[PDB]
């Protein structure tokens, strides 16, 4: 193919993760703008290409207002393009650092939307495996803007409650104890990450952190975290309750997305 290069004009960088760069682009025939996730494929292995197909496949399957929409998937000689609807408000990540933290009200609304996107994945038999603020995009800069779940690069399929060893993958500070313990795991790992995100929403820094990554993983596995003063003094216990239920070490004892959305604090 030259199907992308022929039909799209690439514009500015929007963002990047570990192995892609996302640029705004414009479709020539329409003048409509999109986000083109670009992956250099020269270096890539058979497994890496199957992962791209998997990404495109699962994104299409999960089409929904709170999930990024895939417009096309195109392989040229040296690059693959996943063309998505453009989400213009930037990463939740940015907005959090811009504000330091969200009020309980706004955190509550934001995590509600995140959990709605996650539950949408789970009730369609998908575990995302890489929930974090970099992978949640905002429809705009306005308060309570819609939240869009992105980056299905690691997403895989699972039946219901089932758990199996789906491999060592995710983003370190968001990884679940069970992934770190190399135990079989399932949808419930995304809920752990939502716990980490909600904690970040409330004080603007993560509950597990260490410069030594070996130590970070220790902390996660042990579920060692607390609510330090003065940051957390004004935060309601009910908010802290919801975090505790998500940051429950044993995944069998962990709150699901469905019953997270029913928490009084939500």
């Amino acid at each position: 193919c030259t199907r992308f290069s022929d039909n799209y004009d690439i514009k500015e960088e929007l963002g990047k993760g570990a192995f892609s760069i996302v640029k705004r682009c414009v479709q020539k025939s329409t003048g409509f703008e999109f986000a083109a996730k670009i992956i250099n494929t020269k270096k890539l292995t058979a497994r890496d290409f199957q992962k791209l197909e998997r990404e495109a496949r699962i994104c299409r399957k999960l089409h929904h207002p709170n999930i990024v929409r895939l417009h096309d998937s195109i392989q040229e000689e040296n690059y693959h393009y996943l063309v998505f609807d453009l989400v213009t408000g930037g990463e939740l990540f940015e907005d959090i650092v811009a504000r330091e933290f969200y009020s309980e009200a706004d955190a509550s609304h934001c995590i509600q939307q995140i959990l709605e996107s996650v539950n949408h994945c789970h009730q369609n038999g998908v575990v995302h495996r890489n929930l974090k603020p970099e992978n949640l995009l905002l429809a705009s800069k306005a308060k309570g803007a819609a939240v869009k779940l992105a980056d299905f690069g690691l997403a895989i399929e699972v039946q219901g409650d089932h758990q199996a060893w789906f491999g060592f993958a995710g983003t370190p500070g968001y990884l679940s104890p069970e992934v770190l313990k190399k135990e079989p795991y399932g949808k419930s790992v995304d809920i752990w990450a939502c716990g980490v995100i909600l904690y970040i929403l409330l004080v603007g820094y993560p509950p597990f952190w260490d410069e030594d990554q070996h130590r970070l993983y220790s902390q996660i596995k042990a579920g060692a975290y607390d609510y330090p003063s003065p940051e957390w003094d004004t935060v309601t216990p009910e908010a802290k309750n919801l975090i505790n239920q998500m940051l429950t070490v044993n995944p069998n004892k962990r709150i699901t997305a469905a019953e997270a959305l029913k928490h009084p604090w939500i």
Binding site: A18, A169, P206, W209
Partner: peptide, 16 residues
């Protein structure tokens, strides 16, 4: 401790 971006990892190892 602060909020900083973090790269994705995938070491596979998935087992049939």
């Amino acid at each position: 401790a602060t909020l900083a971006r973090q790269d994705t990892i995938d070491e596979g190892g998935e087992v049939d």
